[PDB]
């Protein structure tokens, strides 16, 4: 289907890692 390349996979993997990291940091901020 969505025939994509390797860089659009590496970038999305790093984006997901950054997204979960930002989720954890935002949770830390909102807990206090």
């Amino acid at each position: 289907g969505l025939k994509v390349g390797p860089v659009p996979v590496l970038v999305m993997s790093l984006l997901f890692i950054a997204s979960v990291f930002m989720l954890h940091i935002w949770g830390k901020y909102t807990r206090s």
């Binding site: 990291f21 954890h24 940091i25 830390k28």
Partner: protein, 61 residues
């Protein structure tokens, strides 16, 4: 009467092993060194990744 099939399978096993090509000392050394290099690379890369990520895991959680 399952003794006969088992004996036949065992005889085939030793026959095949007799005509199998066992690794030589040079071949065994080459494979062992390659496996050691691969194990070192992957295991130590993962070990350092885990060691780096322990403090961040402590910080975020």
């Amino acid at each position: 009467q399952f003794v006969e099939p088992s004996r036949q399978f065992v005889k085939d096993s030793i026959r095949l092993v007799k005509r199998c090509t066992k690794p030589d000392r040079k071949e065994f050394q080459k494979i062992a060194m390659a496996t050691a290099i691969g194990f070192a690379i992957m295991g130590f890369i993962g070990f350092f990744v885990k060691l780096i990520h322990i403090p961040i895991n402590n910080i975020i959680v």
